[PDB]
Design a protein around this ligand. Structure first.
Ligand SMILES: OC[C@H]1O[C@H](O[C@H]2[C@H](O)[C@@H](O)[C@@H](O)O[C@@H]2CO)[C@H](O)[C@@H](O)[C@@H]1O
Length: 363
């Protein structure tokens, strides 16, 4: 319903929207242009619905994987920073938001899942996945409803999204049905079957458990840290357990800011991002609300790199793989989500599930 003269930003609920709003207020003072920060439910799936008929927000925040599918539908505007601006952010972060030669977004931060453990309850964290299942429910709790959390275990011994080869992603070469993904999932289902974990554990349940001091371990991102801080739990962040000597390989996501192609405030959006958001102060404001992880801007990243928790995020990142941004990621996530959920709940076996996932992605 139009939108000229003001900015409407969409960012997920788990990130620093109040922090981003302080940035909005700084822009506002100087420019006179109102900045509105919203966090709707399932904005990543809702963007395409609204953006298609020239609606929605001016700017959108999300991990880079969804962006390539957005780019291909003609929903994003081309971002055009000069080469001097480009030199401020790490080159690999620019590579993430590069679709078909064109920059479709500004890189903000690098996110990776880590092992979060209660130091008072468990002073020394388990080095392997196989030493977790012990006698009773005594174990870890993490979101099992979102494929993003169980991925690290599945990829650990061989699973892969899309075969990466010669710069291209073999879309017809999906690897969720090999023996590495089958072992990862069988291990997870065995945890559930042997009752050390519940199949309905979601984000909120898992978070509550750890913040209330009911669980000694959990798996989460840099955005989770704020909640644990206020909860007063003595926690440490470290590397993901190994599975059969192989490190867990988490999917590396780059929080990105894309600009709607229907937005009449294209230059206002551009000015907010380069002059206000992507500065030391800009990123500091958002980081205070809920941590971002490893930031794209070198200057602020250099200060942030000595923090022990960021160090662990990075180690997990370099042992993982950057997510593909192509348009086949959307269907990839539904296939894996359905596969993990079915298998854990007893709808079908590990072999049945994964085969179906493969088949639906390779169609
Ligand atoms: O579970 C699949 C889901 O994974 C990623 O979503 C992450 C997101 O990037 C993180 O920043 C954080 O919000 O949590 C999400 C997990 O619920 C992908 O970005 C997303 O496309 C995909 O659906």
């Amino acid at each position: 319903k139009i939108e000229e003269g003001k900015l409407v930003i969409w960012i997920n609920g788990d990130k620093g929207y109040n922090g981003l709003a302080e940035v909005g207020k700084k822009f506002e003072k100087d420019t006179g242009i109102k900045v509105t920060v919203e966090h709707p439910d399932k904005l990543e799936e809702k963007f395409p619905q609204v953006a298609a008929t020239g609606d929605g927000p001016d700017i959108i925040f999300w991990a880079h994987d969804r962006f390539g599918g957005y780019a291909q539908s003609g929903l994003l505007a081309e971002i055009t920073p000069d080469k001097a601006f480009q030199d401020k952010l790490y080159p690999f972060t620019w590579d993430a938001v590069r679709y078909n030669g064109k920059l479709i977004a500004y890189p903000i931060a690098v996110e990776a899942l880590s092992l979060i453990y209660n130091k008072d309850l468990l002073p020394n964290p388990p080095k392997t996945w196989e030493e977790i299942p012990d006698p009773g429910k005594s174990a870890l709790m993490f979101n099992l409803q979102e494929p993003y959390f169980t991925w690290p275990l599945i990829a650990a011994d061989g699973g892969y999204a899309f075969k990466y080869e010669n710069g291209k992603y073999d879309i017809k070469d999906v690897g969720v049905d090999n023996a590495g993904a089958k072992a990862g999932l069988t291990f997870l289902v065995d945890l559930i079957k042997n009752k050390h974990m519940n199949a309905d554990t979601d984000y909120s349940i898992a978070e509550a458990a750890f913040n209330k001091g009911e669980t000694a371990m959990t798996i989460n991102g840099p955005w989770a840290w704020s909640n644990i801080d206020t909860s007063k739990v003595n926690y440490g962040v470290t590397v993901l357990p190994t599975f059969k000597g192989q490190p867990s390989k988490p999917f590396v996501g780059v929080l990105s800011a894309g600009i709607n192609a229907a937005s009449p405030n294209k230059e206002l959006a551009k000015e907010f991002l380069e002059n206000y958001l992507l500065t030391d102060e800009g990123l500091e404001a958002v980081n205070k609300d809920k941590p971002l992880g490893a930031v794209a801007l070198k200057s602020y990243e250099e200060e942030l790199a000595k923090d022990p928790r960021i160090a662990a995020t990075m180690e997990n990142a370099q042992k993982g793989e950057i997510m593909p941004n192509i348009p086949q990621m959307s269907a990839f996530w539904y296939a894996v989500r359905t596969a993990v959920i079915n298998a854990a709940s007893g709808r079908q076996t590990v072999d049945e599930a994964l085969k179906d996932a493969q088949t639906r992605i390779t169609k």
